[PDB]
């Protein structure tokens, strides 16, 4: 993550991030809504950061330092560039909505009143088709990536040294290879929980309540489609095992 | 310090997310209670042994039968949660959650945890449940369910007051370390 965004999302909540004089200007319900939107953007910033650890720290480090067989790095990190493109674009839209809402003279005081339309756009049309295609592929290669990682860590000395080296700093404590893979897989199922809680505090403007209701429906449709399109790939699995599924 | 993995399972209203948040911060949130939990690696020393215990939530995966088992690989201990204010969450333990965990995590110890124990003597809780001919889960009903499902043990806690929370994760660490 870049320092500007880390600092903007350093506080435990929107109510702790904005100046107390600005917080006092809002009703309780608006504060509750803003605290949940802030959690959605803050967890999205962290998810994009998890994808950068996978592409830049792990993947690129293995390509530039290790001598792994061809197709090994792809097997360890399936669809990471496509996932990073989907979420970096979605994060950019969320952060631009926050930036446009800032009060003149402030880099922390804002209120986001129109999130629903942004979520409908993200979870419909070509962007939803790409999210569905990418997560169905990634989640079907999850078991295979974990097994390939375990084999390499236990048999390749230079691979073990590389992993121990790049995961040694305290800031990588929660972000080893297998941990990043599960963080990414679990990301999509966090959206309905966050969207439903934002909806609970967005009844003040009927158009906003309707937009978040449509977005929650679209996210659930995407999740059902991804869940139905998953079948774990297994290295060396025979055709007979597959057609007898 | 050896690395161990913990996964918490149970119905959406069992309080698993809150339990992981309160343990990881050693505090019930004073300003904002988060909607979600990402992951955490807790440094725990139990009976003189140092462990790094990675914590994972399954909240949001309850309706997705092909996404949810992706959380299980290499789990060392399962926390199977129910809410003491919800006898319906306890009923879903033996033939929904238990067969799933025994299939994807064979031989992994299961600790049955009764969450929200502070609501056992709550008047609003007792009045609400009585409308559906129900009452808060009794300690003996919890112990009997744990015995029935072959759980390693039965424990209770309150994420609200923190009572019993440290003991749950210290016992889960002990269970993860066993042969
Ligand atoms: C006890 O502290 C007073 C306070 O102001 N809390 C902020 C706050 N309270 C929330 C409730 C629901 C959703 C989001 C919320 N955000
Ligand atoms: C109910 O909690 C009991 C417990 O032992 N929690 C672990 C724990 N202790 C911490 C201290 C500082 C920061 C984070 C911490 N996390």
PDB file of C-alpha atoms in Angstrom, chain A residues 68-221:
ATOM      1  CA  UNK A  68      11.986 -23.445 -10.772  1.00  0.00           C
ATOM      2  CA  UNK A  69      10.674 -25.634 -13.630  1.00  0.00           C
ATOM      3  CA  UNK A  70       8.431 -23.908 -16.270  1.00  0.00           C
ATOM      4  CA  UNK A  71       4.781 -23.605 -15.199  1.00  0.00           C
ATOM      5  CA  UNK A  72       5.697 -23.891 -11.496  1.00  0.00           C
ATOM      6  CA  UNK A  73       5.262 -20.165 -10.561  1.00  0.00           C
ATOM      7  CA  UNK A  74       1.913 -20.029 -12.473  1.00  0.00           C
ATOM      8  CA  UNK A  75       0.761 -23.124 -10.529  1.00  0.00           C
ATOM      9  CA  UNK A  76       1.665 -21.485  -7.199  1.00  0.00           C
ATOM     10  CA  UNK A  77      -0.114 -18.172  -8.039  1.00  0.00           C
ATOM     11  CA  UNK A  78      -2.964 -18.846 -10.525  1.00  0.00           C
ATOM     12  CA  UNK A  79      -4.749 -15.734 -11.982  1.00  0.00           C
ATOM     13  CA  UNK A  80      -2.851 -13.276  -9.672  1.00  0.00           C
ATOM     14  CA  UNK A  81      -2.412 -10.579 -12.376  1.00  0.00           C
ATOM     15  CA  UNK A  82      -6.128 -10.791 -13.361  1.00  0.00           C
ATOM     16  CA  UNK A  83      -7.183 -10.649  -9.657  1.00  0.00           C
ATOM     17  CA  UNK A  84      -4.862  -7.660  -9.058  1.00  0.00           C
ATOM     18  CA  UNK A  85      -6.377  -5.820 -12.102  1.00  0.00           C
ATOM     19  CA  UNK A  86     -10.025  -6.417 -10.942  1.00  0.00           C
ATOM     20  CA  UNK A  87      -9.428  -5.252  -7.333  1.00  0.00           C
ATOM     21  CA  UNK A  88      -7.001  -2.373  -8.070  1.00  0.00           C
ATOM     22  CA  UNK A  89      -9.625  -0.904 -10.436  1.00  0.00           C
ATOM     23  CA  UNK A  90     -12.455  -1.384  -7.867  1.00  0.00           C
ATOM     24  CA  UNK A  91     -10.218   0.157  -5.124  1.00  0.00           C
ATOM     25  CA  UNK A  92      -9.469   3.126  -7.436  1.00  0.00           C
ATOM     26  CA  UNK A  93     -13.205   3.791  -7.883  1.00  0.00           C
ATOM     27  CA  UNK A  94     -13.865   3.576  -4.089  1.00  0.00           C
ATOM     28  CA  UNK A  95     -10.940   5.938  -3.257  1.00  0.00           C
ATOM     29  CA  UNK A  96     -12.014   8.435  -5.990  1.00  0.00           C
ATOM     30  CA  UNK A  97     -15.587   8.512  -4.513  1.00  0.00           C
ATOM     31  CA  UNK A  98     -13.988   9.289  -1.079  1.00  0.00           C
ATOM     32  CA  UNK A  99     -11.628  11.920  -2.580  1.00  0.00           C
ATOM     33  CA  UNK A 100     -14.420  13.782  -4.437  1.00  0.00           C
ATOM     34  CA  UNK A 101     -16.419  13.899  -1.161  1.00  0.00           C
ATOM     35  CA  UNK A 102     -13.616  15.607   0.881  1.00  0.00           C
ATOM     36  CA  UNK A 103     -14.397  19.039   2.330  1.00  0.00           C
ATOM     37  CA  UNK A 104     -12.238  21.828   0.846  1.00  0.00           C
ATOM     38  CA  UNK A 105      -9.278  22.353   3.146  1.00  0.00           C
ATOM     39  CA  UNK A 106      -9.377  18.740   4.453  1.00  0.00           C
ATOM     40  CA  UNK A 107      -7.697  15.430   3.555  1.00  0.00           C
ATOM     41  CA  UNK A 108      -9.806  13.398   6.104  1.00  0.00           C
ATOM     42  CA  UNK A 109     -13.330  14.891   6.405  1.00  0.00           C
ATOM     43  CA  UNK A 110     -15.823  13.344   3.964  1.00  0.00           C
ATOM     44  CA  UNK A 111     -19.220  11.575   3.780  1.00  0.00           C
ATOM     45  CA  UNK A 112     -20.037   9.018   1.003  1.00  0.00           C
ATOM     46  CA  UNK A 113     -23.792   9.179   0.309  1.00  0.00           C
ATOM     47  CA  UNK A 114     -23.908   7.248  -3.063  1.00  0.00           C
ATOM     48  CA  UNK A 115     -22.067   3.893  -2.787  1.00  0.00           C
ATOM     49  CA  UNK A 116     -24.891   1.737  -4.228  1.00  0.00           C
ATOM     50  CA  UNK A 117     -24.391   2.788  -7.868  1.00  0.00           C
ATOM     51  CA  UNK A 118     -20.656   2.032  -7.674  1.00  0.00           C
ATOM     52  CA  UNK A 119     -21.416  -1.473  -6.285  1.00  0.00           C
ATOM     53  CA  UNK A 120     -24.094  -2.131  -8.988  1.00  0.00           C
ATOM     54  CA  UNK A 121     -21.492  -1.218 -11.656  1.00  0.00           C
ATOM     55  CA  UNK A 122     -18.803  -3.468 -10.087  1.00  0.00           C
ATOM     56  CA  UNK A 123     -21.136  -6.476  -9.724  1.00  0.00           C
ATOM     57  CA  UNK A 124     -22.879  -6.247 -13.144  1.00  0.00           C
ATOM     58  CA  UNK A 125     -21.897  -6.420 -16.875  1.00  0.00           C
ATOM     59  CA  UNK A 126     -18.373  -7.161 -18.135  1.00  0.00           C
ATOM     60  CA  UNK A 127     -16.719  -6.502 -14.746  1.00  0.00           C
ATOM     61  CA  UNK A 128     -18.964  -9.150 -13.034  1.00  0.00           C
ATOM     62  CA  UNK A 129     -18.335 -11.593 -15.931  1.00  0.00           C
ATOM     63  CA  UNK A 130     -14.576 -11.108 -15.420  1.00  0.00           C
ATOM     64  CA  UNK A 131     -14.853 -11.532 -11.577  1.00  0.00           C
ATOM     65  CA  UNK A 132     -16.911 -14.726 -12.033  1.00  0.00           C
ATOM     66  CA  UNK A 133     -14.513 -16.194 -14.643  1.00  0.00           C
ATOM     67  CA  UNK A 134     -11.373 -15.282 -12.608  1.00  0.00           C
ATOM     68  CA  UNK A 135     -12.651 -16.566  -9.188  1.00  0.00           C
ATOM     69  CA  UNK A 136     -14.077 -19.795 -10.738  1.00  0.00           C
ATOM     70  CA  UNK A 137     -10.564 -20.450 -12.209  1.00  0.00           C
ATOM     71  CA  UNK A 138      -8.616 -19.345  -9.045  1.00  0.00           C
ATOM     72  CA  UNK A 139     -10.779 -21.245  -6.536  1.00  0.00           C
ATOM     73  CA  UNK A 140     -10.647 -24.433  -8.746  1.00  0.00           C
ATOM     74  CA  UNK A 141      -6.795 -24.246  -8.607  1.00  0.00           C
ATOM     75  CA  UNK A 142      -6.648 -23.572  -4.815  1.00  0.00           C
ATOM     76  CA  UNK A 143      -5.897 -27.164  -3.658  1.00  0.00           C
ATOM     77  CA  UNK A 144      -3.305 -27.620  -6.450  1.00  0.00           C
ATOM     78  CA  UNK A 145      -1.421 -24.383  -5.491  1.00  0.00           C
ATOM     79  CA  UNK A 146      -1.272 -25.430  -1.786  1.00  0.00           C
ATOM     80  CA  UNK A 147       0.023 -28.910  -2.655  1.00  0.00           C
ATOM     81  CA  UNK A 148       2.648 -27.573  -5.093  1.00  0.00           C
ATOM     82  CA  UNK A 149       3.846 -25.096  -2.416  1.00  0.00           C
ATOM     83  CA  UNK A 150       4.192 -27.854   0.226  1.00  0.00           C
ATOM     84  CA  UNK A 151       6.141 -30.098  -2.158  1.00  0.00           C
ATOM     85  CA  UNK A 152       8.633 -27.297  -3.072  1.00  0.00           C
ATOM     86  CA  UNK A 153       9.143 -26.135   0.560  1.00  0.00           C
ATOM     87  CA  UNK A 154       9.927 -29.694   1.696  1.00  0.00           C
ATOM     88  CA  UNK A 155      12.220 -30.709  -1.226  1.00  0.00           C
ATOM     89  CA  UNK A 156      13.923 -27.513  -2.533  1.00  0.00           C
ATOM     90  CA  UNK A 157      16.552 -25.920  -0.230  1.00  0.00           C
ATOM     91  CA  UNK A 158      16.823 -22.663  -2.210  1.00  0.00           C
ATOM     92  CA  UNK A 159      12.975 -22.360  -2.216  1.00  0.00           C
ATOM     93  CA  UNK A 160      12.813 -22.841   1.587  1.00  0.00           C
ATOM     94  CA  UNK A 161      15.576 -20.193   2.062  1.00  0.00           C
ATOM     95  CA  UNK A 162      13.742 -17.758  -0.249  1.00  0.00           C
ATOM     96  CA  UNK A 163      10.421 -18.199   1.630  1.00  0.00           C
ATOM     97  CA  UNK A 164      12.055 -17.907   5.087  1.00  0.00           C
ATOM     98  CA  UNK A 165      13.877 -14.770   3.888  1.00  0.00           C
ATOM     99  CA  UNK A 166      10.927 -12.799   2.427  1.00  0.00           C
ATOM    100  CA  UNK A 167       8.429 -13.822   5.172  1.00  0.00           C
ATOM    101  CA  UNK A 168      10.828 -13.014   8.088  1.00  0.00           C
ATOM    102  CA  UNK A 169       9.755  -9.316   8.632  1.00  0.00           C
ATOM    103  CA  UNK A 170       6.995  -8.789  11.217  1.00  0.00           C
ATOM    104  CA  UNK A 171       4.769  -6.984   8.640  1.00  0.00           C
ATOM    105  CA  UNK A 172       4.513 -10.365   6.731  1.00  0.00           C
ATOM    106  CA  UNK A 173       3.330 -12.306   9.874  1.00  0.00           C
ATOM    107  CA  UNK A 174      -0.220 -12.973   8.479  1.00  0.00           C
ATOM    108  CA  UNK A 175       0.904 -13.201   4.827  1.00  0.00           C
ATOM    109  CA  UNK A 176       2.787 -16.420   4.046  1.00  0.00           C
ATOM    110  CA  UNK A 177       1.990 -18.055   0.658  1.00  0.00           C
ATOM    111  CA  UNK A 178      -0.877 -20.341   1.820  1.00  0.00           C
ATOM    112  CA  UNK A 179      -2.324 -17.528   3.999  1.00  0.00           C
ATOM    113  CA  UNK A 180      -2.447 -15.118   0.988  1.00  0.00           C
ATOM    114  CA  UNK A 181      -4.222 -17.803  -1.100  1.00  0.00           C
ATOM    115  CA  UNK A 182      -6.958 -18.315   1.537  1.00  0.00           C
ATOM    116  CA  UNK A 183      -7.266 -14.514   2.191  1.00  0.00           C
ATOM    117  CA  UNK A 184      -8.022 -14.063  -1.553  1.00  0.00           C
ATOM    118  CA  UNK A 185     -10.476 -17.003  -1.698  1.00  0.00           C
ATOM    119  CA  UNK A 186     -12.338 -15.677   1.399  1.00  0.00           C
ATOM    120  CA  UNK A 187     -12.537 -12.092   0.073  1.00  0.00           C
ATOM    121  CA  UNK A 188     -15.576 -12.577  -2.169  1.00  0.00           C
ATOM    122  CA  UNK A 189     -17.770 -14.012   0.608  1.00  0.00           C
ATOM    123  CA  UNK A 190     -17.048 -10.918   2.820  1.00  0.00           C
ATOM    124  CA  UNK A 191     -18.962  -8.558   0.410  1.00  0.00           C
ATOM    125  CA  UNK A 192     -22.571  -9.647   1.289  1.00  0.00           C
ATOM    126  CA  UNK A 193     -21.936  -9.180   5.069  1.00  0.00           C
ATOM    127  CA  UNK A 194     -20.498  -5.668   4.531  1.00  0.00           C
ATOM    128  CA  UNK A 195     -23.148  -4.623   1.932  1.00  0.00           C
ATOM    129  CA  UNK A 196     -26.021  -5.864   4.125  1.00  0.00           C
ATOM    130  CA  UNK A 197     -24.740  -3.862   7.161  1.00  0.00           C
ATOM    131  CA  UNK A 198     -24.274  -0.712   5.008  1.00  0.00           C
ATOM    132  CA  UNK A 199     -27.876  -1.250   3.724  1.00  0.00           C
ATOM    133  CA  UNK A 200     -29.154  -1.480   7.346  1.00  0.00           C
ATOM    134  CA  UNK A 201     -27.933   2.125   7.939  1.00  0.00           C
ATOM    135  CA  UNK A 202     -28.910   3.570   4.497  1.00  0.00           C
ATOM    136  CA  UNK A 203     -32.715   3.947   4.823  1.00  0.00           C
ATOM    137  CA  UNK A 204     -32.546   7.792   4.928  1.00  0.00           C
ATOM    138  CA  UNK A 205     -32.525   8.096   1.110  1.00  0.00           C
ATOM    139  CA  UNK A 206     -34.929   5.652  -0.625  1.00  0.00           C
ATOM    140  CA  UNK A 207     -32.916   5.667  -3.919  1.00  0.00           C
ATOM    141  CA  UNK A 208     -29.800   4.608  -1.892  1.00  0.00           C
ATOM    142  CA  UNK A 209     -31.705   1.839  -0.076  1.00  0.00           C
ATOM    143  CA  UNK A 210     -32.950   0.539  -3.483  1.00  0.00           C
ATOM    144  CA  UNK A 211     -29.425   0.708  -5.057  1.00  0.00           C
ATOM    145  CA  UNK A 212     -27.798  -1.238  -2.193  1.00  0.00           C
ATOM    146  CA  UNK A 213     -30.670  -3.791  -2.329  1.00  0.00           C
ATOM    147  CA  UNK A 214     -29.941  -4.340  -6.088  1.00  0.00           C
ATOM    148  CA  UNK A 215     -26.130  -4.550  -5.387  1.00  0.00           C
ATOM    149  CA  UNK A 216     -26.619  -7.137  -2.607  1.00  0.00           C
ATOM    150  CA  UNK A 217     -28.682  -9.265  -5.046  1.00  0.00           C
ATOM    151  CA  UNK A 218     -25.987  -8.972  -7.763  1.00  0.00           C
ATOM    152  CA  UNK A 219     -23.170  -9.981  -5.356  1.00  0.00           C
ATOM    153  CA  UNK A 220     -25.198 -13.041  -4.223  1.00  0.00           C
ATOM    154  CA  UNK A 221     -25.835 -14.035  -7.902  1.00  0.00           C
TER     155      UNK A 221
END
